[PDB]
Write an enzyme that holds these catalytic residues in place. Structure first.
Site, PDB file in Angstrom:
ATOM      1  N   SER A   1       4.603  -6.343 -20.328  1.00 46.30           N
ATOM      2  CA  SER A   1       3.824  -5.300 -20.980  1.00 46.30           C
ATOM      3  C   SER A   1       2.993  -5.929 -22.085  1.00 46.30           C
ATOM      4  O   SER A   1       3.525  -6.635 -22.951  1.00 46.30           O
ATOM      5  CB  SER A   1       4.740  -4.216 -21.534  1.00 46.30           C
ATOM      6  OG  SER A   1       5.349  -4.630 -22.743  1.00 46.30           O
TER       7      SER A   1
ATOM      8  N   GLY B   1       4.594  -7.701 -28.994  1.00 45.06           N
ATOM      9  CA  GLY B   1       4.595  -9.041 -29.544  1.00 45.06           C
ATOM     10  C   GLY B   1       5.203 -10.076 -28.624  1.00 45.06           C
ATOM     11  O   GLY B   1       4.506 -10.975 -28.147  1.00 45.06           O
TER      12      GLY B   1
ATOM     13  N   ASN C   1       8.446   2.799 -12.943  1.00 45.97           N
ATOM     14  CA  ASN C   1       8.868   1.479 -12.502  1.00 45.97           C
ATOM     15  C   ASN C   1       9.227   1.465 -11.024  1.00 45.97           C
ATOM     16  O   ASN C   1       9.046   0.443 -10.357  1.00 45.97           O
ATOM     17  CB  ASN C   1      10.045   1.008 -13.351  1.00 45.97           C
ATOM     18  CG  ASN C   1       9.720   0.975 -14.825  1.00 45.97           C
ATOM     19  OD1 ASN C   1       8.685   0.451 -15.235  1.00 45.97           O
ATOM     20  ND2 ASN C   1      10.601   1.545 -15.635  1.00 45.97           N
TER      21      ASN C   1
ATOM     22  N   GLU D   1      -3.589 -16.900   0.497  1.00 46.52           N
ATOM     23  CA  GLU D   1      -4.792 -16.337   1.102  1.00 46.52           C
ATOM     24  C   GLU D   1      -5.325 -15.154   0.317  1.00 46.52           C
ATOM     25  O   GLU D   1      -5.641 -14.109   0.892  1.00 46.52           O
ATOM     26  CB  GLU D   1      -4.511 -15.940   2.548  1.00 46.52           C
ATOM     27  CG  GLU D   1      -4.167 -17.099   3.467  1.00 46.52           C
ATOM     28  CD  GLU D   1      -3.826 -16.645   4.875  1.00 46.52           C
ATOM     29  OE1 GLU D   1      -3.379 -17.483   5.685  1.00 46.52           O
ATOM     30  OE2 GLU D   1      -4.010 -15.445   5.172  1.00 46.52           O
TER      31      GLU D   1
HETATM   32  N1  LIG Z   1       5.125   0.966 -17.508  1.00 42.74           N
HETATM   33  C1  LIG Z   1       5.984   0.754 -18.495  1.00 42.74           C
HETATM   34  N2  LIG Z   1       5.527   0.359 -19.737  1.00 42.74           N
HETATM   35  C2  LIG Z   1       6.398   0.144 -20.752  1.00 42.74           C
HETATM   36  C3  LIG Z   1       7.755   0.317 -20.555  1.00 42.74           C
HETATM   37  N3  LIG Z   1       8.386   0.041 -21.711  1.00 42.74           N
HETATM   38  C4  LIG Z   1       7.459  -0.310 -22.635  1.00 42.74           C
HETATM   39  N4  LIG Z   1       6.220  -0.242 -22.058  1.00 42.74           N
HETATM   40  C5  LIG Z   1       4.934  -0.552 -22.706  1.00 42.74           C
HETATM   41  O1  LIG Z   1       5.075  -1.692 -23.529  1.00 42.74           O
HETATM   42  C6  LIG Z   1       4.306  -1.553 -24.709  1.00 42.74           C
HETATM   43  C7  LIG Z   1       4.969  -2.268 -25.881  1.00 42.74           C
HETATM   44  O2  LIG Z   1       5.619  -3.441 -25.449  1.00 42.74           O
HETATM   45  P1  LIG Z   1       7.184  -3.402 -25.089  1.00 42.74           P
HETATM   46  O3  LIG Z   1       7.417  -3.910 -23.686  1.00 42.74           O
HETATM   47  O4  LIG Z   1       7.711  -1.997 -25.236  1.00 42.74           O
HETATM   48  O5  LIG Z   1       7.894  -4.357 -26.167  1.00 42.74           O
HETATM   49  P2  LIG Z   1       7.835  -5.952 -25.995  1.00 42.74           P
HETATM   50  O6  LIG Z   1       6.857  -6.336 -24.909  1.00 42.74           O
HETATM   51  O7  LIG Z   1       9.214  -6.465 -25.682  1.00 42.74           O
HETATM   52  O8  LIG Z   1       7.343  -6.514 -27.420  1.00 42.74           O
HETATM   53  P3  LIG Z   1       8.235  -6.309 -28.742  1.00 42.74           P
HETATM   54  O9  LIG Z   1       7.838  -5.012 -29.392  1.00 42.74           O
HETATM   55  O10 LIG Z   1       7.979  -7.450 -29.693  1.00 42.74           O
HETATM   56  O11 LIG Z   1       9.704  -6.264 -28.386  1.00 42.74           O
HETATM   57  C8  LIG Z   1       4.191  -0.061 -24.950  1.00 42.74           C
HETATM   58  O12 LIG Z   1       2.883   0.264 -25.359  1.00 42.74           O
HETATM   59  C9  LIG Z   1       4.498   0.587 -23.617  1.00 42.74           C
HETATM   60  O13 LIG Z   1       3.343   1.206 -23.104  1.00 42.74           O
HETATM   61  C10 LIG Z   1       8.224   0.716 -19.310  1.00 42.74           C
HETATM   62  O14 LIG Z   1       9.425   0.875 -19.125  1.00 42.74           O
HETATM   63  N5  LIG Z   1       7.335   0.935 -18.282  1.00 42.74           N
HETATM   64  N1  LIG Z   2      -5.978 -10.902  20.249  1.00 40.33           N
HETATM   65  C1  LIG Z   2      -5.271 -11.070  19.106  1.00 40.33           C
HETATM   66  N2  LIG Z   2      -5.941 -11.323  17.954  1.00 40.33           N
HETATM   67  C2  LIG Z   2      -5.279 -11.496  16.786  1.00 40.33           C
HETATM   68  C3  LIG Z   2      -3.815 -11.406  16.789  1.00 40.33           C
HETATM   69  N3  LIG Z   2      -3.412 -11.615  15.523  1.00 40.33           N
HETATM   70  C4  LIG Z   2      -4.524 -11.821  14.777  1.00 40.33           C
HETATM   71  N4  LIG Z   2      -5.637 -11.750  15.526  1.00 40.33           N
HETATM   72  C5  LIG Z   2      -7.022 -11.933  15.031  1.00 40.33           C
HETATM   73  O1  LIG Z   2      -7.088 -13.104  14.220  1.00 40.33           O
HETATM   74  C6  LIG Z   2      -7.848 -12.860  13.033  1.00 40.33           C
HETATM   75  C7  LIG Z   2      -7.144 -13.517  11.856  1.00 40.33           C
HETATM   76  O2  LIG Z   2      -6.903 -14.887  12.163  1.00 40.33           O
HETATM   77  P1  LIG Z   2      -5.780 -15.720  11.368  1.00 40.33           P
HETATM   78  O3  LIG Z   2      -4.411 -15.157  11.652  1.00 40.33           O
HETATM   79  O4  LIG Z   2      -6.056 -15.715   9.883  1.00 40.33           O
HETATM   80  O5  LIG Z   2      -5.917 -17.208  11.966  1.00 40.33           O
HETATM   81  P2  LIG Z   2      -5.205 -18.449  11.219  1.00 40.33           P
HETATM   82  O6  LIG Z   2      -5.845 -18.656   9.868  1.00 40.33           O
HETATM   83  O7  LIG Z   2      -5.380 -19.695  12.050  1.00 40.33           O
HETATM   84  O8  LIG Z   2      -3.735 -18.156  11.043  1.00 40.33           O
HETATM   85  C8  LIG Z   2      -7.941 -11.352  12.866  1.00 40.33           C
HETATM   86  O9  LIG Z   2      -9.304 -10.969  12.659  1.00 40.33           O
HETATM   87  C9  LIG Z   2      -7.422 -10.755  14.158  1.00 40.33           C
HETATM   88  O10 LIG Z   2      -8.452  -9.997  14.794  1.00 40.33           O
HETATM   89  C10 LIG Z   2      -3.154 -11.128  18.085  1.00 40.33           C
HETATM   90  O11 LIG Z   2      -1.909 -11.035  18.168  1.00 40.33           O
HETATM   91  N5  LIG Z   2      -3.929 -10.977  19.162  1.00 40.33           N
END
Ligand SMILES: Nc1nc2c(ncn2[C@@H]2O[C@H](COP(=O)(O)OP(=O)(O)OP(=O)(O)O)[C@@H](O)[C@H]2O)c(=O)[nH]1
Ligand SMILES: Nc1nc2c(ncn2[C@@H]2O[C@H](COP(=O)(O)OP(=O)(O)O)[C@@H](O)[C@H]2O)c(=O)[nH]1
Ligand SMILES: Nc1nc2c(ncn2[C@@H]2O[C@H](COP(=O)(O)OP(=O)(O)OP(=O)(O)O)[C@@H](O)[C@H]2O)c(=O)[nH]1
Ligand SMILES: Nc1nc2c(ncn2[C@@H]2O[C@H](COP(=O)(O)OP(=O)(O)O)[C@@H](O)[C@H]2O)c(=O)[nH]1
Ligand SMILES: [Mg+2]
Ligand SMILES: [Mg+2]
Lengths: 430, 48, 141, 430, 430, 430
Positions: free
Chosen positions: D131, D135, D219, D245
């Site tokens: 987050s 700090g 979360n 990739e």
């Molecule tokens: N999405 C999410 N954000 C959180 C959560 N808990 C804290 N935050 C965010 O974290 C920000 C502050 O940082 P924290 O993670 O709470 O505290 P810290 O990162 O440990 O930093 P310290 O205050 O020094 O301990 C807040 O503005 C919150 O928005 C959480 O459980 N979920």
């Molecule tokens: N005919 C066929 N085409 C496939 C298959 N799997 C992937 N492709 C084609 O292969 C392309 C992706 O190639 P890629 O897997 O990245 O090749 P590589 O980089 O050599 O692993 C996609 O655009 C698909 O259309 C398959 O099982 N059959």
């Protein structure tokens, strides 16, 4: 003889392979324990194409799995048919790339690639007669698009006369899952044109469109897209594993579909595809297959093929059928659509017949056509790239690992030059 | 080293050795083949 | 830097009268800070062998110069082969700290009592000249 | 082989750490005693036989909260000597916890961090909670981040800071230490997420229908967001995302890494099941300005990049169909130099429910992490609050007498002015 | 006929022998009570090589065990197969050496060695036709490296025409267990070059590396290192105890692997080695054996064999296999690696085939290659020796027992001369 | 056939001897009566039928402690006439116990030593314990060492002296006799170990969490260290170490043999089992400056050689993997002329626990004996304390009137100056 090894990288490539190998094993009757339980004699004659032989009579794929993170390979092992893969071929790092191309190509991918290249060299040196390699990876990811493309150059430097296949998924702007997709797409396309003998683009958007409109299933998943891609992948090499009227290996397709060495970016499609409720209505005939084969919505790419003209086309029919009907239908599909076929190369459709159909189907077709309509994908990729690069957004991630903006400028210029010179032949006339 | 210098070294070893395959000749033939592949690649790059 | 100590062994005076050594071939060992230096044997050495040998030693940590004097003696083995052996005449130890102040300004002449290890009696006296060849302690800090 | 360490400092940090650590223990099936009656490895470590120890450390100078922790039901879980406690509180004084009493405690914390890090082999990065308006929290967080940035270097650190509300405040001096801590973590933290309490109070009041909330309810929502973010590391998914990739996808420039989050759905069991909770409606609710987890209006600024995670039974095609709808709307506009701004992740594990809590059990959920230009308002209002009292030098004597120099207040003001100018400079179109 | 006696000294040598004799007894089907219970006729035809015959039909090894302290031999007797050793052959002192080379070579080792030489003379004078002696000892200990090497000179002085083997463990700088290792290593190498007909260096660091990387077992112990060393030891003399296509005794290897009398320091390796989980995946074929045999990580020494050029190489295949395949594979491993083979000696690989494989394995290979890469070990040993000797550290312990610094200077000079003249032939050209 | 004799003189010596003799009797299963209800032979002797007699002798001029021993539970254990006792105490006067009353008692002690030595056949050496800051302890220890050095000669003697703390002191005159005793044992003892009380007080306070320790708690830790040092002589181990194998590994030069010890782990049963106590973490804790058993800072000086003992189920590879990590760290630096400085010992018997004591039962432990250049600080501070009172000749009349000459104080000062100069001369790099 004339067999090929499988190499896949990244998560997308690993997921594609996890279904491709299942499809192949089901086609050849191999149980998930590696034991043959097939019915026909032909199921074992040419099994050396994809499978190796070990003591105890079980079979093991000659696949190499690489990634910069261990999760995907630790997950694919627990899936069905996951035990077939040899544990020794699993190589991985402990860090990952994070969808950053620089990390997966300069800093991390450079040190790790020695171990995977060792096993790649072990696999290729041993095999009877090499035909080539096939690569599955995604251009939308960092580690994949970096390490795979650097491995392409390393393999090409050591085997300049063999053939190289790449099945590449490019990031579409419609379904975007990564914000840094344009950077590593543009950087990868720069290196991919220089080394790959064949490239086949696949888009997730087109797969979703197909699943929603043709199959009409409610909830598509990655398993369906992977299954379609796997069927398309298997259809290409079917006649190399089975007898037929006109056998045609990968090199023969390379000769007949690539007019100039830099024009090798194809888009594919598979037929037939029907919904569960309409699978009884339809009757499987050659006209029905060929009308769906050239359908625009059936392409595995969002590119619209009636926005350009085909330089050439190919079809790989499966099942037992008359050749006269196939030839006359190919002629008819070319006479009724003369506006969409380039005129200075006559008879620009190749056909092949294989007598062994897929399990469960009586006829099937795989379509591979080189068309000028593919320019639209590079246009939009470059548009997004130049929209993002002008502000130097996300550039520091790449520049912090030894890369500079000059390599971005050169990549953009080369990609634009490719776009321009690919359409140069569209307006060419005799 | 020029392609002609490597060929002249191979011919001079052919005149000195009673055996068609000395280890030194095999290394020079491998060097020559690697260089012809590089020159062919440079010509294919210039023709693009 | 390691300090250089120059040690000259001038002569030794053997005091033990009960060994009228018919033909002594006396030789000496000077040890300082793990470094060992040896004289050549004096041919026809009397009770007062002169060596006049100077050595430079590097000082790392030790403060003690050890002097030992030996004679060659020929003993017949059980097979009547003549075997040469080195018999200690005496050993002495000098602490260089006792002479350090004077030995820095000029060479210092020093007598070292050599005792026989078996009876601790004065066997001989060695006459040594010691010359010692820090300002940089702030520079190192 | 992938690990992450979470740091909890201050009362808010410890009270949200408790909230996340009930949830993780519940999600992995571990009893409060630490005993089970391979996904745990990301957050926990195996002791060889029996109990699991969290990879977390609790810090505070004021002993009450730690003593409450060491006597509750979770007394047996945490290692006895990683709950570092002081004797004297900083008492919302930033200079105290950065110069006077925090220095004597920081060494023990760093020793504990080293002892925890040597155990991990695939350390992804650090998490920190504090987050800001206190700090000890702000001061010790600043000091720990500054020590870690030089001890480890390139390891990624993520900060879930809780800034004060626009008008609601518990202290009277919190703007001073908030500004100083923002100064400290601006150049030291890779990601910072906004978490002010007022927005979450409004969320609870409107959706959860609680008229008298306490900190625990806040979360718990934060803990759910953390779990959604880190689910991709410990569960199988169709589209995975790693921590590394992120700076390649959400951080256009090194200075700009403050973004605000949102979550959906938030609903009680009394009326949750009456509606279908489709993916489209939840992804619409996630983008509602009133559901932002920080009290900022996204309508007042542009978007830069959106990274948003799904979990449950969601299908990618439904995700794409909803991203398109959002791109359609006229009230949400992205920045000019970003054509695509979405990174999408999909996971299979549905969110877990805590008994006696507020949220109900649902099969689909969405968590978005979005970087937007509108965040500058909180900086502007905090700056205005700071200037009012700094004009007359009020409360300064409480800081000058704790070792801090007079000029230290001015440079934080200059850095905030620089940040506000940078945010304005980035948001203008080319 | 053409049998050899076993002599071991020190704790390390005793522990090596305690597993070597167990391996030999298990190979010949001898129970720990000395009673034969084997299955095949060939198990008894050439048992006179290592075992003597006594009344009652039991067999007793012709091994001599010596140490300066009684603990290790009092411990090896209680272990399995410990009763086979004749109690009369146990000779020991009451004081020990304390890892001091001078004590174990001048003062204490000189008086005791008469008793052990008496039993050594008893064993050698009696046997049908002597082939030679094999010695196991460690260079990192005082009593071993002193008494063993002095015994080498004493044996050589009395049997100048017989052959002498030494398996010597040299102290690596990585895993150091004794501070005075360089002194007694350098002193021992001086004497070892003058008298030993063959020397085989073994390093604990390389054994740990092999156990961790190839076998991939979690917790290596001295029992595993001893087992690997024992298998390597047994592999050398296999064809002398069993029939085969091309029998090759130790003297034949001595003729073919030592070009000049002072270059007799080899490094060895054993194949195949596979993990428990991958023992079913692999198929045992000659190519699989030969690819692992020349692998750099498979060497029993940390020396990197691609940092130098092989002067010569040897392989001892086991099992029933075709000779044409062995010869063609040996040719192939020499054509593809011409850069790492010295050019002025053509056809520098020796091969041998024995029809009796190890118990439990169908094929096995023992590799003994004389390479110039061994210089690095002497370089680092001499580097540590000269780093420690320049300050006369620990010198008083050695100089208090009749030794002087002149013998240290001569040893250092001779070792450096050996290092120089061993690499002299690396740069030599025809 | 390996024996050792321990000498206990003075109140502190007897009180630590009691502490070690409960532990040995407990570890070998011998009841306090001396009756068992082949490893005992190192410390004990068999009487033919029944009881065992320790190979120890207790000395003191003041009868209270011996009378306490002869009435406790251990009255039946010790031989009645090896507990030599005087009538009049030396009363902290060194000259008394070296010139006045110790001479009339020393003859009986020497007769007892002879009577105990004639029984042993493989005498390894002597152990002696004495608190230095007392009259009878220091004086009689000096006199006994001086008599033994000429009666036996080259037999090894080890001294576990307890020097006074830097600032904490019980007497007021202990610097005088401490300096004199250091003079006496500098040229007469082979090993001296530092044991001041303040460091062990801090260890107990920090780890054992005892706020009111007594002398027994200190003596139990010292007893555990002694047991760890001597375990290798009476238990089977993978890497043994003898007492005579020390001056060849820890003593670079005859003058320098003062070293300081440490032990790990030290932990109570209340929180011991919550953490795994891996070998890496214990070997890291052993090298922590705060865990030194003497109040000296190792960060203030270089290391010369480290001899460190393990016991339990530790595997050597894990030990090597931890020695490498320590060599990696930048805060621990070794002297230039010592490339490797570690001697490692491994034993199988885990440390034994004493009922009602402080330490818990653990499976792994480490005891290190390290010789470092930083020890000169204690000599410098003792010298400074001595000079202050020797300037005015205070308390000298209590020594001149007991037969000691006036000049005897000066030469001890000169020897300390020589030792301090030697320590500085050794620590400089070449
Ligand atoms: N999405 C999410 N954000 C959180 C959560 N808990 C804290 N935050 C965010 O974290 C920000 C502050 O940082 P924290 O993670 O709470 O505290 P810290 O990162 O440990 O930093 P310290 O205050 O020094 O301990 C807040 O503005 C919150 O928005 C959480 O459980 N979920
Ligand atoms: N005919 C066929 N085409 C496939 C298959 N799997 C992937 N492709 C084609 O292969 C392309 C992706 O190639 P890629 O897997 O990245 O090749 P590589 O980089 O050599 O692993 C996609 O655009 C698909 O259309 C398959 O099982 N059959
Ligand atoms: N570690 C430890 N030190 C002790 C113990 N008892 C006394 N000492 C130390 O011994 C010093 C004084 O010597 P003592 O052993 O007490 O007495 P003494 O050696 O018998 O000499 P006298 O006074 O003549 O009897 C004090 O400074 C204490 O620090 C003890 O039980 N453990
Ligand atoms: N392979 C193996 N090596 C050991 C074993 N025990 C000790 N060593 C090695 O031997 C070295 C110490 O040799 P040491 O026992 O002093 O030989 P000694 O002086 O003749 O008794 C250590 O560096 C260990 O690496 C064992 O059981 N197996
Ligand atoms: Mg607080
Ligand atoms: Mg007393």
């Amino acid at each position: 003889m004339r067999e090929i090894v499988h190499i896949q990288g990244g998560q997308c490539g690993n997921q594609i392979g996890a279904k491709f190998w299942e499809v192949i094993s089901d086609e050849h009757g191999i149980d998930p324990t590696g034991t043959y339980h097939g019915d026909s004699d032909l199921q074992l004659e040419r099994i050396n194409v994809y499978y190796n032989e070990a003591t105890g009579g079980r079979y093991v794929p000659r696949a190499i799995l690489m990634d910069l993170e261990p999760g995907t390979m630790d997950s694919v092992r627990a899936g069905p048919f996951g035990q077939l893969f040899r544990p020794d071929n699993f190589v991985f790092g402990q860090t990952g790339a994070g969808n950053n191309w620089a990390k997966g190509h300069y800093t991390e991918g450079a040190e790790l690639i020695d171990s995977v290249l060792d096993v790649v060299r072990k696999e290729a040196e041993g095999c009877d007669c090499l035909q080539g390699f096939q690569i599955t990876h995604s251009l939308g990811g960092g580690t994949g698009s970096g390490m795979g493309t650097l491995l392409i150059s390393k393999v090409r430097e050591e085997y300049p006369d063999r053939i190289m296949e790449t099945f590449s998924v490019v990031p579409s702007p419609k379904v975007s899952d990564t914000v840094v997709e344009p950077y590593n797409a543009t950087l990868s396309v720069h290196q991919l044109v220089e080394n790959a003998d064949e490239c086949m683009v696949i888009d997730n958007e087109a797969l979703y469109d197909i699943c929603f409109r043709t199959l009409k299933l409610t909830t598509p998943t990655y398993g369906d897209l992977n299954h379609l891609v796997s069927a398309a992948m298997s259809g290409v090499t079917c006649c190399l594993r089975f007898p037929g009227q006109l056998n045609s290996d990968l090199r023969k397709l390379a000769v007949n579909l690539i007019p100039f060495p830099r024009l090798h970016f194809f888009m594919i499609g598979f037929a037939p595809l029907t919904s569960r409720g309409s699978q009884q209505y339809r009757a499987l005939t050659v006209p029905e297959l060929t009308q769906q084969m050239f359908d625009a919505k059936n392409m595995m790419c969002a590119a619209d093929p009636r926005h350009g003209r085909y330089l050439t086309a190919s079809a790989l029919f499966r099942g037992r059928m008359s050749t006269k009907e196939v030839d006359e239908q190919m002629l008819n599909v070319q006479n009724k659509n003369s506006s969409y076929f380039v005129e200075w190369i006559p008879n620009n459709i190749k056909s092949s017949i294989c007598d062994i159909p897929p399990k469960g189907l009586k006829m099937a077709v795989t379509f591979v056509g080189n068309s000028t309509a593919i320019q639209e994908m590079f246009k939009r990729v470059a548009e997004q790239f130049t929209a993002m690069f002008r502000r130097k957004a996300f550039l520091h991630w790449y520049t912090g690992e030894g890369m500079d903006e000059m390599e971005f400028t050169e990549a953009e210029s080369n990609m634009n030059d490719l776009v321009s010179e690919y359409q140069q032949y569209q307006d060419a006339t005799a | 080293q020029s392609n002609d210098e490597l060929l002249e070294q191979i011919k001079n070893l052919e005149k000195k050795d009673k055996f068609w395959l000395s280890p030194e000749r095999y290394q020079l033939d491998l060097k020559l083949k690697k260089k012809q592949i590089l020159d062919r690649r440079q010509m294919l790059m210039k023709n693009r | 830097m390691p300090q250089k100590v120059s040690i000259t062994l001038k002569n030794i005076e053997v005091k033990r009268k009960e060994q009228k050594f018919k033909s002594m071939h006396p030789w000496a060992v000077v040890m300082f800070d793990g470094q060992k230096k040896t004289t050549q044997p004096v041919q026809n050495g009397d009770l007062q062998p002169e060596f006049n040998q100077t050595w430079v030693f590097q000082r790392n940590s030790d403060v003690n110069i050890t002097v030992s004097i030996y004679k060659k003696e020929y003993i017949y083995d059980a097979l009547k082969n003549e075997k040469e052996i080195d018999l200690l005449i005496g050993k002495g130890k000098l602490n260089i700290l006792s002479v350090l102040k004077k030995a820095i300004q000029q060479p210092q002449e020093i007598m070292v009592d050599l005792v026989y290890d078996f009876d601790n009696k004065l066997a001989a006296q060695a006459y040594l000249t010691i010359h010692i060849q820090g300002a940089d302690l702030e520079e190192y800090r | 082989m992938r690990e992450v360490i979470s740091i909890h400092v201050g009362q808010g940090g410890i009270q949200v750490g408790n909230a996340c650590w009930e949830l993780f223990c519940l999600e992995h099936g571990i009893q409060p005693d630490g005993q089970m009656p391979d996904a745990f490895n990301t957050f926990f470590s195996e002791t060889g036989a029996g109990k699991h120890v969290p990879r977390a450390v609790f810090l505070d100078l004021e002993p009450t909260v730690i003593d409450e922790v060491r006597t509750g039901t979770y007394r047996q879980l945490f290692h006895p000597e990683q709950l570092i406690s002081g004797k004297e509180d900083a008492a919302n004084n930033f200079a105290r916890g950065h110069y006077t009493i925090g220095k004597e405690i920081v060494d023990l914390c760093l020793d504990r961090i080293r002892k925890l890090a040597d155990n991990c082999t695939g350390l992804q990065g650090f998490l920190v909670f504090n987050s800001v308006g206190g700090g000890t929290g702000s001061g010790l967080g600043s000091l720990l981040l500054e020590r870690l940035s030089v001890d480890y270097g390139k390891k990624s650190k993520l900060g879930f800071t809780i800034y004060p509300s626009p008008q609601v405040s518990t202290a009277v001096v919190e703007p001073y230490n908030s500004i100083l801590s923002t100064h400290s973590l601006l150049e030291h933290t890779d990601v910072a997420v906004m978490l002010d309490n007022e927005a979450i109070y409004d969320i609870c009041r409107r959706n959860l229908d609680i008229e008298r909330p306490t900190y625990t309810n806040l979360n718990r929502l934060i803990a759910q967001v953390i779990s959604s973010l880190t689910a991709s590391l410990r569960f199988d998914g169709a589209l995975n995302v790693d921590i590394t990739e992120f700076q390649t996808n959400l951080v256009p420039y090194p200075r700009i890494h403050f973004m605000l989050s949102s979550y959906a759905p938030i609903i009680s069991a009394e009326k949750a099941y009456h509606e279908q909770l489709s993916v489209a409606e939840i992804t619409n609710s996630a983008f509602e300005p009133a559901n932002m987890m920080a009290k900022c209006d996204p309508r007042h600024g542009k978007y830069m990049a959106c990274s948003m995670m799904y979990r449950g039974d969601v299908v990618p095609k439904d995700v794409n169909a909803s991203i398109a709808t959002i791109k359609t709307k006229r009230t949400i506009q992205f920045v000019d130099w970003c054509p695509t701004g979405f990174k999408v992740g999909i996971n299979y594990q549905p969110p877990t429910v805590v008994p006696g809590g507020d949220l109900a059990k649902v099969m689909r959920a969405v968590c978005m992490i979005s970087n937007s230009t509108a965040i500058a308002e909180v900086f502007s209002r905090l700056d205005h609050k700071f200037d009012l009292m700094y004009a007359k030098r009020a409360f300064v004597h409480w800081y000058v007498g704790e070792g801090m120099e007079e000029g230290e207040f001015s440079e934080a003001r200059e850095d905030l002015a620089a940040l506000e100018k940078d945010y304005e400079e980035v948001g203008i179109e080319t």
